[PDB]
Structure 1
Amino acid sequence: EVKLVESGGGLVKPGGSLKLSCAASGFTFNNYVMVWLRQTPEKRLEWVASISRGGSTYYPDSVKGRFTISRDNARNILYLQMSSLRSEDTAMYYCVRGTTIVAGDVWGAGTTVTVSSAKTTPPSVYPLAPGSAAQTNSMVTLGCLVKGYFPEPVTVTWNSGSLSSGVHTFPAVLQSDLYTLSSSVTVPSSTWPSETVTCNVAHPASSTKVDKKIVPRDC
């Protein structure tokens, strides 16, 4: 169980600074080159920094001078100090163990960095229920619309996690510096009104959590 765990990621202003940490375990840390990579919202993978076992550091021109990789072989922790951040620095950052042939054989789960002047904004949660004059047809699809939040992420569950299947939770989309995401859930006809159906929407950046019960619409 070699493991790398990144933390420290979050929202920060252009021009700002932010330090990522990557805690290593289950292997002899000082024996390895360590690497930061990042994956852009488009899914492109890019090299960010490398640090040899003895502390030799290497950077691509795009971050050189702005980012600093360092390691602490005592605590087995790798750092990335980010400064003069730009919006192009927005990405998921991965802690990676490198090998002598420059393959990354262990990767962390990643930490997300968002570089923006937009301010943290909690979501509004609207119930999606069929029109009052909609016709009942066995299964019923409901939803929650999660609008006007920043930054990512938001989590959505149904019935605190007990409505598990029949769920489609869509990727958030950013418009005018606010995210919108939706989630749909499908359950059998008689299952609804009868059984309570609620979506639970967490927005940790704003310390927000709210539940929206989905009630049948009535003229």
Structure 2
Amino acid sequence: EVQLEESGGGLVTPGGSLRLSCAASGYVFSTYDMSWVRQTPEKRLEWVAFISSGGGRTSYPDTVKGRFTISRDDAKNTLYLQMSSLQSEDTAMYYCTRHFYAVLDYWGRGTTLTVSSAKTTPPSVYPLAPGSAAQTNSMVTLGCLVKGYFPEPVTVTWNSGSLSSGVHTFPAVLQSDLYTLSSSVTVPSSTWPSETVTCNVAHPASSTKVDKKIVP
């Protein structure tokens, strides 16, 4: 089976350089033309580079011409994307794809690139309580607001994993160079506030953990 595996991304700072790799296997790599394409956090796809069989023709959109260089090493079945003068607009998941007779058929799993000046920062955790007592019914929904961290990810659990049904942990948003996200859990009204509910937030990059108790 055809397999494409990209690697080399991570966290870099604006103005920096990096080289991604796309390792191919299961077909004769040298016969086909290839492209790198990226997917932005807004979820748009952008083509970013192309190289032909033989490596004699390469082409790029104007947004990266002069900064990115695509190349290929047929002896190793690997496609490279050399990136310099990185800017935060390069933050995206990068994917290599092969041109199989004008069909972009196989795509690798992708590798994450985050271009940011932010420093590593633990989140502050705020409790989301219903407050207004004119509830809805017999289930109550609580939450945790996890604000200002960098970089991703964060993991959230409720009562150290004891509470797992009805939890919703939302994708993050980027506000002012830092991420924010929320998580909520719906529990039977006989439970809270008689019993304690806590959100346990772990931020691996800062090696930080915050346990926040939700009180009416």
Please indicate the TM-score interval, normalised by the length of the shorter structure.
0.7 to 0.9
Identity %: 81
Unmatched runs of 5 consecutive residues or more in structure 1:
none
Q: Is the 8 A contact 1:200 1:209 kept in 2?
A: no
Alpha-carbon deviations, 1:155-183, whole Å to 9, x = none? 44446667554232223222222221111
Relative to the length of structure 1, the TM-score reads 0.78
Amino acid aligned to 1:70: S
Hey, what's the Cα distance between the residues in 2 that align with 1:182 and 1:139?
19
Deviation by residue 1:166-217 (Cα, 9 ceiling, x = unmatched): 232223222222221111122333455788755454544x253535354544
Count of residue pairs the alignment pairs up: 215
Distance 1:214 1:28 in 2: 58
How far apart, in 2, do the equivalents of 1:180 and 1:126 lie?
11
Q: Give the superposed CA RMSD.
A: 3.1
8 Å Cα contact 2:92/2:112 also seen in 1: yes
| TM-fit CA distance, 1:66 | 0.8
1:147 aligns with: 147
Of 189-198 and 151-160, deviating more is: 189-198
Alpha-carbon displacement from aligned partner over 1:125-168 (angstroms, at most 9, x marks no partner): 33434449686942221222111112344344446667554232
1:72 and 1:160 map into 2 onto residues whose CA distance is 49
Q: Is contact 1:130-1:216 (8 Å) kept?
A: no
Whole-Å Cα distance in 2 between the matches of residues 163 and 99 of structure 1? 49
Q: Tell me if the contact between 1:29 and 1:73 (Cα under 8 Å) persists in the aligned partners.
A: yes
- Range moving further from structure 2, 77-86 or 65-74: 65-74
SS state of the match for residue 54, structure 1?
A: helix
Q: How does 1:100-115 map to 2 (within 5 A)?
A: 100-101=101-102, 103-115=103-115
Question: Where does residue 95 of structure 1 map in the other structure?
Answer: 96
1:212 maps to which residue?
211
Question: Deviations for 1:88-122, whole angstroms, at most 9, x for unmatched residues?
Answer: 22222122222221x32122232222222222222
**Could you tell which deviates more after superposition, 153-162 or 86-95?**
153-162
Task: Structure 2: state its 5+ residue gaps.
Answer: none
Structure 1 residue 83: deviation in Å? 0.2
Structure 1 counterpart of 2:110, which letter? G
Deviates more, 1:91-100 or 1:207-216: 207-216
